[PDB]
Amino acid sequence: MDRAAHAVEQWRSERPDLDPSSMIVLGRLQEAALVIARDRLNPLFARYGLQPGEFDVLATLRRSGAPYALTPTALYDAAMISSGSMTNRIDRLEKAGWVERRATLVALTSAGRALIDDAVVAHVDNQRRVLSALSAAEQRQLAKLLDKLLQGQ
Amino acid sequence: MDRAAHAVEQWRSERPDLDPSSMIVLGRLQEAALVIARDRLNPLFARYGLQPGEFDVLATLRRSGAPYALTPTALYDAAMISSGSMTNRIDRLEKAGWVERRATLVALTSAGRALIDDAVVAHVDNQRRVLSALSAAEQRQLAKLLDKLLQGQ
């Protein structure tokens, strides 16, 4: 038993008036997102000098196509993840030499483009190893369920 | 198309040398965990005066059974989520009147026990509405896939 199943077992024992079933799926959802970010994805980003949020900004600019320049609002809408604190994240990226503010647009520098071109290859390799315990059909299956859960929000 | 599918589409266009397939499932995983915490679970915790991490501490103590007292190490291992910054989280809970440090043990106060007894009912109701777009079999299915992904870490 993992954290979530052990906790439901205890709750069923302590609060039999409760139906704690929903705790399994959502406890595993949040634990899986946390452990994968903390122990798998973020270490790789740190090897490139990046926080995960900073990777997303650079990746979003790169995949928007040349000249890799978006308004901060277009940047948020196109991001992989809808996290906050973006303005200071852009500030950091400009100070590091990876983005540039132009007219208002946020654009990759050449150094930033080279960095994310390098990092995204290592990232996807990292992701495949993260997912390798699931078969192809299991990954498609997990993506369909997460899509339905997400739209339900 | 959601964030993750739109981003894969762009990557496939921009870096056809890349296989970005892994981005869908893991992008949806992290986005779903974030949106559900930010927009659904944490608002409910805040109505009880709690941060999500603080809810977990109180819930872990309560479901460990009377006298609802655990060592900080037992507390971490029994938590629903393996998040950090726990020592300051305990500090805050003691200052709020909800936990007590005894001999070293962390124990619910009566006020803390009453609070989490109230909050956990609202929490599970909140979770069921979060999950209501998935059928029962879909929720069991999602919990099985997340379990396999998790153990693969």
Tab-separated table of N, CA and C in Angstrom, chain B residues 3-147:
chain	number	residue	atom	x	y	z
B	3	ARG	N	-3.751	22.863	-23.365
B	3	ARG	CA	-2.377	23.361	-23.405
B	3	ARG	C	-1.429	22.301	-23.939
B	4	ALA	N	-1.531	21.085	-23.402
B	4	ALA	CA	-0.553	20.044	-23.701
B	4	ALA	C	-0.613	19.615	-25.166
B	5	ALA	N	-1.815	19.437	-25.717
B	5	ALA	CA	-1.909	19.007	-27.111
B	5	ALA	C	-1.478	20.113	-28.057
B	6	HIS	N	-1.836	21.360	-27.746
B	6	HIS	CA	-1.413	22.464	-28.594
B	6	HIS	C	0.106	22.581	-28.605
B	7	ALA	N	0.740	22.361	-27.452
B	7	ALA	CA	2.192	22.486	-27.361
B	7	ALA	C	2.902	21.373	-28.131
B	8	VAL	N	2.401	20.140	-28.028
B	8	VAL	CA	2.961	19.043	-28.813
B	8	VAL	C	2.823	19.337	-30.302
B	9	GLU	N	1.667	19.864	-30.714
B	9	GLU	CA	1.477	20.220	-32.115
B	9	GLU	C	2.542	21.205	-32.575
B	10	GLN	N	2.789	22.246	-31.778
B	10	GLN	CA	3.816	23.216	-32.133
B	10	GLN	C	5.196	22.572	-32.172
B	11	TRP	N	5.525	21.746	-31.172
B	11	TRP	CA	6.839	21.104	-31.146
B	11	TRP	C	7.035	20.200	-32.357
B	12	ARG	N	6.029	19.379	-32.674
B	12	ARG	CA	6.111	18.536	-33.863
B	12	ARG	C	6.380	19.370	-35.107
B	13	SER	N	5.777	20.558	-35.180
B	13	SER	CA	6.029	21.452	-36.305
B	13	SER	C	7.446	22.015	-36.257
B	14	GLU	N	7.892	22.461	-35.077
B	14	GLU	CA	9.149	23.201	-34.987
B	14	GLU	C	10.372	22.291	-34.902
B	15	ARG	N	10.252	21.143	-34.240
B	15	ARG	CA	11.361	20.214	-34.021
B	15	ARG	C	10.922	18.834	-34.480
B	16	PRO	N	10.722	18.637	-35.785
B	16	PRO	CA	10.288	17.318	-36.264
B	16	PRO	C	11.287	16.218	-35.957
B	17	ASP	N	12.527	16.574	-35.619
B	17	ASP	CA	13.513	15.611	-35.145
B	17	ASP	C	13.186	15.080	-33.752
B	18	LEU	N	12.199	15.673	-33.072
B	18	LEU	CA	11.818	15.337	-31.705
B	18	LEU	C	10.599	14.427	-31.687
B	19	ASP	N	10.553	13.517	-30.712
B	19	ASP	CA	9.299	12.843	-30.411
B	19	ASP	C	8.751	13.432	-29.119
B	20	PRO	N	7.783	14.344	-29.180
B	20	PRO	CA	7.326	15.032	-27.962
B	20	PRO	C	6.113	14.386	-27.315
B	21	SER	N	5.863	13.115	-27.632
B	21	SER	CA	4.621	12.467	-27.218
B	21	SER	C	4.467	12.468	-25.701
B	22	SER	N	5.549	12.168	-24.977
B	22	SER	CA	5.516	12.121	-23.516
B	22	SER	C	5.002	13.410	-22.890
B	23	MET	N	4.964	14.509	-23.650
B	23	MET	CA	4.563	15.798	-23.090
B	23	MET	C	3.074	15.849	-22.772
B	24	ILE	N	2.255	15.076	-23.489
B	24	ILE	CA	0.809	15.130	-23.282
B	24	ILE	C	0.453	14.636	-21.887
B	25	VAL	N	0.833	13.394	-21.574
B	25	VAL	CA	0.422	12.790	-20.310
B	25	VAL	C	1.038	13.539	-19.130
B	26	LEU	N	2.328	13.889	-19.214
B	26	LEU	CA	2.960	14.537	-18.067
B	26	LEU	C	2.567	16.011	-17.963
B	27	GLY	N	2.328	16.681	-19.096
B	27	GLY	CA	1.797	18.035	-19.038
B	27	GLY	C	0.398	18.075	-18.451
B	28	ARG	N	-0.456	17.121	-18.845
B	28	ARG	CA	-1.793	17.061	-18.257
B	28	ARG	C	-1.744	16.654	-16.794
B	29	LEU	N	-0.811	15.768	-16.429
B	29	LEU	CA	-0.667	15.376	-15.029
B	29	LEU	C	-0.357	16.582	-14.159
B	30	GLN	N	0.650	17.368	-14.549
B	30	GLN	CA	1.052	18.488	-13.702
B	30	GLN	C	0.016	19.606	-13.742
B	31	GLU	N	-0.582	19.850	-14.905
B	31	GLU	CA	-1.621	20.878	-14.970
B	31	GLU	C	-2.847	20.487	-14.150
B	32	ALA	N	-3.253	19.214	-14.207
B	32	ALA	CA	-4.424	18.801	-13.442
B	32	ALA	C	-4.163	18.906	-11.946
B	33	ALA	N	-2.983	18.477	-11.492
B	33	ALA	CA	-2.674	18.595	-10.074
B	33	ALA	C	-2.687	20.053	-9.642
B	34	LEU	N	-2.108	20.930	-10.462
B	34	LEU	CA	-2.011	22.343	-10.108
B	34	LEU	C	-3.387	23.007	-10.065
B	35	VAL	N	-4.191	22.819	-11.116
B	35	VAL	CA	-5.480	23.510	-11.195
B	35	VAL	C	-6.411	23.032	-10.092
B	36	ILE	N	-6.396	21.724	-9.810
B	36	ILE	CA	-7.268	21.173	-8.774
B	36	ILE	C	-6.863	21.697	-7.401
B	37	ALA	N	-5.561	21.693	-7.106
B	37	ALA	CA	-5.103	22.273	-5.852
B	37	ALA	C	-5.451	23.751	-5.782
B	38	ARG	N	-5.046	24.519	-6.803
B	38	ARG	CA	-5.180	25.972	-6.746
B	38	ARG	C	-6.637	26.412	-6.711
B	39	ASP	N	-7.474	25.827	-7.569
B	39	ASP	CA	-8.828	26.320	-7.788
B	39	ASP	C	-9.900	25.551	-7.026
B	40	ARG	N	-9.593	24.367	-6.496
B	40	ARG	CA	-10.636	23.543	-5.889
B	40	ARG	C	-10.334	23.165	-4.442
B	41	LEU	N	-9.180	22.537	-4.195
B	41	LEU	CA	-8.904	22.030	-2.856
B	41	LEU	C	-8.468	23.148	-1.920
B	42	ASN	N	-7.464	23.922	-2.331
B	42	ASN	CA	-6.939	24.969	-1.458
B	42	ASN	C	-7.962	26.026	-1.082
B	43	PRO	N	-8.878	26.477	-1.955
B	43	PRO	CA	-9.935	27.376	-1.465
B	43	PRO	C	-10.702	26.791	-0.302
B	44	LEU	N	-11.039	25.499	-0.353
B	44	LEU	CA	-11.786	24.906	0.751
B	44	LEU	C	-10.952	24.902	2.027
B	45	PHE	N	-9.683	24.502	1.929
B	45	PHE	CA	-8.819	24.552	3.101
B	45	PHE	C	-8.757	25.959	3.682
B	46	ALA	N	-8.687	26.980	2.817
B	46	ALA	CA	-8.581	28.360	3.294
B	46	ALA	C	-9.831	28.804	4.032
B	47	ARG	N	-10.985	28.248	3.669
B	47	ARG	CA	-12.197	28.557	4.411
B	47	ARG	C	-12.124	28.048	5.842
B	48	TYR	N	-11.289	27.038	6.104
B	48	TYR	CA	-11.065	26.537	7.452
B	48	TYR	C	-9.828	27.142	8.093
B	49	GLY	N	-9.228	28.144	7.454
B	49	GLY	CA	-8.035	28.765	7.984
B	49	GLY	C	-6.769	27.969	7.774
B	50	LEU	N	-6.751	27.058	6.802
B	50	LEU	CA	-5.656	26.113	6.608
B	50	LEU	C	-5.026	26.248	5.226
B	51	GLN	N	-3.691	26.113	5.172
B	51	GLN	CA	-2.979	25.790	3.942
B	51	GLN	C	-3.082	24.294	3.667
B	52	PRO	N	-2.959	23.868	2.398
B	52	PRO	CA	-3.114	22.425	2.117
B	52	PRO	C	-2.143	21.566	2.897
B	53	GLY	N	-0.882	21.995	2.986
B	53	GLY	CA	0.070	21.265	3.803
B	53	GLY	C	-0.385	21.170	5.247
B	54	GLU	N	-0.961	22.260	5.780
B	54	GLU	CA	-1.424	22.252	7.169
B	54	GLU	C	-2.605	21.307	7.354
B	55	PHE	N	-3.513	21.250	6.372
B	55	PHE	CA	-4.589	20.262	6.415
B	55	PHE	C	-4.027	18.848	6.530
B	56	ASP	N	-3.000	18.538	5.727
B	56	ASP	CA	-2.412	17.196	5.722
B	56	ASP	C	-1.861	16.820	7.095
B	57	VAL	N	-1.186	17.759	7.760
B	57	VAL	CA	-0.653	17.467	9.087
B	57	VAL	C	-1.783	17.123	10.034
B	58	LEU	N	-2.815	17.975	10.078
B	58	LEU	CA	-3.929	17.713	10.983
B	58	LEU	C	-4.641	16.418	10.616
B	59	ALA	N	-4.871	16.195	9.318
B	59	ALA	CA	-5.530	14.963	8.893
B	59	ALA	C	-4.696	13.740	9.248
B	60	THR	N	-3.381	13.839	9.100
B	60	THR	CA	-2.532	12.700	9.427
B	60	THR	C	-2.587	12.383	10.917
B	61	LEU	N	-2.560	13.411	11.768
B	61	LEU	CA	-2.645	13.181	13.209
B	61	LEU	C	-3.988	12.578	13.582
B	62	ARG	N	-5.080	13.147	13.055
B	62	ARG	CA	-6.411	12.643	13.380
B	62	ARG	C	-6.559	11.183	12.983
B	63	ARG	N	-6.154	10.835	11.759
B	63	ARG	CA	-6.441	9.472	11.342
B	63	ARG	C	-5.479	8.473	11.950
B	64	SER	N	-4.432	8.936	12.632
B	64	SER	CA	-3.589	7.984	13.341
B	64	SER	C	-4.259	7.458	14.600
B	65	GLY	N	-5.443	7.960	14.948
B	65	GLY	CA	-6.169	7.488	16.109
B	65	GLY	C	-5.716	8.151	17.399
B	66	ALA	N	-6.575	8.056	18.408
B	66	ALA	CA	-6.289	8.693	19.683
B	66	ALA	C	-4.996	8.126	20.265
B	67	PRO	N	-4.177	8.948	20.948
B	67	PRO	CA	-4.361	10.370	21.272
B	67	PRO	C	-3.964	11.339	20.159
B	68	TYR	N	-3.868	10.857	18.915
B	68	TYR	CA	-3.602	11.717	17.760
B	68	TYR	C	-2.246	12.394	17.900
B	69	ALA	N	-1.234	11.594	18.234
B	69	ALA	CA	0.102	12.088	18.516
B	69	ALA	C	1.122	11.239	17.767
B	70	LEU	N	1.985	11.893	16.994
B	70	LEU	CA	3.017	11.194	16.238
B	70	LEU	C	4.322	11.960	16.332
B	71	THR	N	5.434	11.224	16.239
B	71	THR	CA	6.727	11.859	16.057
B	71	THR	C	6.729	12.599	14.720
B	72	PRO	N	7.535	13.659	14.578
B	72	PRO	CA	7.574	14.353	13.279
B	72	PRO	C	7.958	13.423	12.142
B	73	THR	N	8.789	12.418	12.417
B	73	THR	CA	9.154	11.468	11.369
B	73	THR	C	7.985	10.553	11.011
B	74	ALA	N	7.276	10.021	12.011
B	74	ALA	CA	6.080	9.243	11.707
B	74	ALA	C	5.067	10.097	10.969
B	75	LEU	N	5.010	11.388	11.304
B	75	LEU	CA	4.078	12.303	10.650
B	75	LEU	C	4.370	12.407	9.155
B	76	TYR	N	5.642	12.600	8.797
B	76	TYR	CA	6.021	12.672	7.386
B	76	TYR	C	5.680	11.383	6.640
B	77	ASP	N	6.032	10.227	7.212
B	77	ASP	CA	5.784	8.969	6.508
B	77	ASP	C	4.290	8.693	6.322
B	78	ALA	N	3.435	9.172	7.228
B	78	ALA	CA	2.003	8.883	7.148
B	78	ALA	C	1.225	9.936	6.381
B	79	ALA	N	1.888	11.010	5.949
B	79	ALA	CA	1.189	12.094	5.279
B	79	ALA	C	0.621	11.611	3.952
B	80	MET	N	-0.458	12.261	3.516
B	80	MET	CA	-0.983	11.976	2.185
B	80	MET	C	0.017	12.373	1.105
B	81	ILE	N	0.701	13.507	1.293
B	81	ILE	CA	1.607	14.088	0.306
B	81	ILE	C	2.988	14.271	0.929
B	82	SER	N	4.028	13.979	0.159
B	82	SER	CA	5.394	14.045	0.684
B	82	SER	C	6.042	15.414	0.446
B	83	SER	N	5.346	16.485	0.828
B	83	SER	CA	5.890	17.831	0.684
B	83	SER	C	6.855	18.164	1.830
B	84	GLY	N	7.713	19.153	1.586
B	84	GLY	CA	8.698	19.592	2.557
B	84	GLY	C	8.209	20.737	3.427
B	85	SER	N	9.176	21.463	4.002
B	85	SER	CA	8.910	22.629	4.858
B	85	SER	C	7.947	22.294	5.997
B	86	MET	N	8.095	21.097	6.571
B	86	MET	CA	7.141	20.652	7.582
B	86	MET	C	7.403	21.282	8.942
B	87	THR	N	8.670	21.509	9.295
B	87	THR	CA	8.965	22.027	10.629
B	87	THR	C	8.314	23.389	10.838
B	88	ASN	N	8.415	24.272	9.841
B	88	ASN	CA	7.762	25.568	9.958
B	88	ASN	C	6.250	25.425	9.874
B	89	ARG	N	5.771	24.401	9.168
B	89	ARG	CA	4.341	24.123	9.126
B	89	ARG	C	3.825	23.711	10.497
B	90	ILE	N	4.588	22.886	11.218
B	90	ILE	CA	4.227	22.558	12.595
B	90	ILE	C	4.290	23.803	13.472
B	91	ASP	N	5.326	24.626	13.288
B	91	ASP	CA	5.432	25.866	14.054
B	91	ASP	C	4.164	26.699	13.919
B	92	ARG	N	3.702	26.889	12.681
B	92	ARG	CA	2.487	27.662	12.434
B	92	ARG	C	1.279	27.040	13.120
B	93	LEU	N	1.158	25.711	13.051
B	93	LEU	CA	-0.002	25.036	13.621
B	93	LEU	C	-0.012	25.144	15.141
B	94	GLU	N	1.161	25.081	15.772
B	94	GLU	CA	1.221	25.300	17.214
B	94	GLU	C	0.811	26.724	17.570
B	95	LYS	N	1.292	27.709	16.804
B	95	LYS	CA	0.940	29.102	17.072
B	95	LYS	C	-0.554	29.352	16.899
B	96	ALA	N	-1.205	28.607	16.009
B	96	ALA	CA	-2.634	28.765	15.769
B	96	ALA	C	-3.493	28.062	16.811
B	97	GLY	N	-2.890	27.249	17.677
B	97	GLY	CA	-3.625	26.521	18.695
B	97	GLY	C	-4.120	25.152	18.288
B	98	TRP	N	-3.654	24.612	17.155
B	98	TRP	CA	-4.197	23.369	16.615
B	98	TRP	C	-3.350	22.141	16.879
B	99	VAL	N	-2.047	22.295	17.095
B	99	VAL	CA	-1.204	21.183	17.500
B	99	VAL	C	-0.442	21.610	18.742
B	100	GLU	N	0.158	20.620	19.391
B	100	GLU	CA	0.906	20.799	20.621
B	100	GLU	C	2.130	19.908	20.560
B	101	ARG	N	3.280	20.437	20.978
B	101	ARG	CA	4.500	19.639	21.051
B	101	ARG	C	4.648	19.053	22.448
B	102	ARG	N	4.800	17.732	22.515
B	102	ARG	CA	4.911	17.020	23.781
B	102	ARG	C	6.044	15.997	23.676
B	103	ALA	N	6.273	15.202	24.719
B	103	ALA	CA	7.422	14.294	24.711
B	103	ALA	C	7.014	12.816	24.754
B	104	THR	N	9.886	13.375	21.487
B	104	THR	CA	9.105	14.516	21.009
B	104	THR	C	7.937	14.064	20.145
B	105	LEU	N	6.743	14.542	20.483
B	105	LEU	CA	5.518	14.207	19.776
B	105	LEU	C	4.813	15.476	19.313
B	106	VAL	N	4.089	15.359	18.203
B	106	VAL	CA	3.165	16.385	17.733
B	106	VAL	C	1.760	15.821	17.906
B	107	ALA	N	0.914	16.535	18.644
B	107	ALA	CA	-0.423	16.051	18.972
B	107	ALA	C	-1.457	17.118	18.648
B	108	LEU	N	-2.632	16.687	18.171
B	108	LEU	CA	-3.759	17.603	18.017
B	108	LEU	C	-4.131	18.205	19.354
B	109	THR	N	-4.433	19.491	19.345
B	109	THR	CA	-5.199	20.022	20.454
B	109	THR	C	-6.665	19.657	20.259
B	110	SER	N	-7.478	19.917	21.286
B	110	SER	CA	-8.908	19.712	21.104
B	110	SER	C	-9.439	20.613	19.993
B	111	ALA	N	-8.992	21.874	19.959
B	111	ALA	CA	-9.413	22.775	18.890
B	111	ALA	C	-8.970	22.259	17.530
B	112	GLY	N	-7.755	21.707	17.452
B	112	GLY	CA	-7.298	21.140	16.196
B	112	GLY	C	-8.078	19.902	15.804
B	113	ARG	N	-8.418	19.059	16.779
B	113	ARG	CA	-9.208	17.881	16.440
B	113	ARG	C	-10.597	18.271	15.946
B	114	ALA	N	-11.239	19.221	16.623
B	114	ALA	CA	-12.557	19.660	16.170
B	114	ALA	C	-12.468	20.242	14.769
B	115	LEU	N	-11.415	21.023	14.505
B	115	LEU	CA	-11.263	21.658	13.203
B	115	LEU	C	-11.161	20.618	12.093
B	116	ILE	N	-10.242	19.655	12.233
B	116	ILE	CA	-10.030	18.675	11.169
B	116	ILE	C	-11.207	17.704	11.052
B	117	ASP	N	-11.909	17.421	12.162
B	117	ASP	CA	-13.148	16.644	12.098
B	117	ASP	C	-14.209	17.354	11.254
B	118	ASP	N	-14.326	18.674	11.407
B	118	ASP	CA	-15.165	19.490	10.524
B	118	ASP	C	-14.626	19.491	9.090
B	119	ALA	N	-13.349	19.833	8.929
B	119	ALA	CA	-12.806	20.093	7.596
B	119	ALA	C	-12.782	18.841	6.724
B	120	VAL	N	-12.521	17.669	7.311
B	120	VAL	CA	-12.360	16.491	6.461
B	120	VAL	C	-13.674	16.118	5.772
B	121	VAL	N	-14.816	16.369	6.413
B	121	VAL	CA	-16.103	16.120	5.758
B	121	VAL	C	-16.270	17.038	4.552
B	122	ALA	N	-16.006	18.335	4.735
B	122	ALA	CA	-16.117	19.259	3.611
B	122	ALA	C	-15.102	18.916	2.532
B	123	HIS	N	-13.919	18.465	2.946
B	123	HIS	CA	-12.881	18.085	1.994
B	123	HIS	C	-13.348	16.956	1.084
B	124	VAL	N	-13.895	15.878	1.660
B	124	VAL	CA	-14.248	14.734	0.826
B	124	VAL	C	-15.410	15.085	-0.090
B	125	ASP	N	-16.395	15.837	0.416
B	125	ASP	CA	-17.445	16.358	-0.459
B	125	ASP	C	-16.842	17.165	-1.602
B	126	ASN	N	-15.883	18.035	-1.283
B	126	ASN	CA	-15.218	18.816	-2.320
B	126	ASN	C	-14.541	17.906	-3.338
B	127	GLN	N	-13.864	16.852	-2.862
B	127	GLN	CA	-13.158	15.940	-3.764
B	127	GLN	C	-14.124	15.234	-4.711
B	128	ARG	N	-15.286	14.818	-4.204
B	128	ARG	CA	-16.233	14.111	-5.057
B	128	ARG	C	-16.723	15.002	-6.192
B	129	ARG	N	-16.960	16.287	-5.911
B	129	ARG	CA	-17.368	17.202	-6.974
B	129	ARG	C	-16.230	17.413	-7.970
B	130	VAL	N	-14.983	17.450	-7.478
B	130	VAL	CA	-13.822	17.556	-8.363
B	130	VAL	C	-13.787	16.383	-9.335
B	131	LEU	N	-14.140	15.191	-8.861
B	131	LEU	CA	-13.993	13.959	-9.628
B	131	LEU	C	-15.243	13.584	-10.404
B	132	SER	N	-16.308	14.376	-10.288
B	132	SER	CA	-17.621	13.927	-10.729
B	132	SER	C	-17.715	13.764	-12.238
B	133	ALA	N	-16.795	14.360	-13.001
B	133	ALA	CA	-16.800	14.157	-14.446
B	133	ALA	C	-16.333	12.760	-14.839
B	134	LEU	N	-15.655	12.049	-13.945
B	134	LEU	CA	-15.242	10.676	-14.190
B	134	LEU	C	-16.220	9.712	-13.541
B	135	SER	N	-16.578	8.658	-14.270
B	135	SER	CA	-17.412	7.629	-13.673
B	135	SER	C	-16.627	6.887	-12.594
B	136	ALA	N	-17.332	6.041	-11.840
B	136	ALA	CA	-16.669	5.263	-10.797
B	136	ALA	C	-15.546	4.413	-11.382
B	137	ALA	N	-15.841	3.677	-12.457
B	137	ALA	CA	-14.818	2.859	-13.101
B	137	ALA	C	-13.680	3.710	-13.653
B	138	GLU	N	-13.977	4.928	-14.119
B	138	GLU	CA	-12.916	5.811	-14.602
B	138	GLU	C	-12.008	6.259	-13.461
B	139	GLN	N	-12.586	6.541	-12.295
B	139	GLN	CA	-11.771	6.913	-11.146
B	139	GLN	C	-10.899	5.746	-10.692
B	140	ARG	N	-11.477	4.545	-10.577
B	140	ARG	CA	-10.658	3.380	-10.245
B	140	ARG	C	-9.544	3.193	-11.266
B	141	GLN	N	-9.867	3.405	-12.541
B	141	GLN	CA	-8.904	3.258	-13.625
B	141	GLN	C	-7.782	4.279	-13.504
B	142	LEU	N	-8.138	5.533	-13.212
B	142	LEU	CA	-7.126	6.571	-13.058
B	142	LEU	C	-6.231	6.288	-11.858
B	143	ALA	N	-6.809	5.776	-10.764
B	143	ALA	CA	-6.012	5.480	-9.577
B	143	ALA	C	-5.044	4.326	-9.830
B	144	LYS	N	-5.444	3.353	-10.651
B	144	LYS	CA	-4.541	2.250	-10.966
B	144	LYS	C	-3.364	2.723	-11.814
B	145	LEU	N	-3.625	3.553	-12.829
B	145	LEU	CA	-2.537	4.054	-13.668
B	145	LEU	C	-1.581	4.949	-12.877
B	146	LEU	N	-2.120	5.856	-12.054
B	146	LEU	CA	-1.256	6.699	-11.230
B	146	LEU	C	-0.449	5.872	-10.238
B	147	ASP	N	-1.014	4.768	-9.745
B	147	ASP	CA	-0.266	3.905	-8.840
B	147	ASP	C	0.932	3.283	-9.554
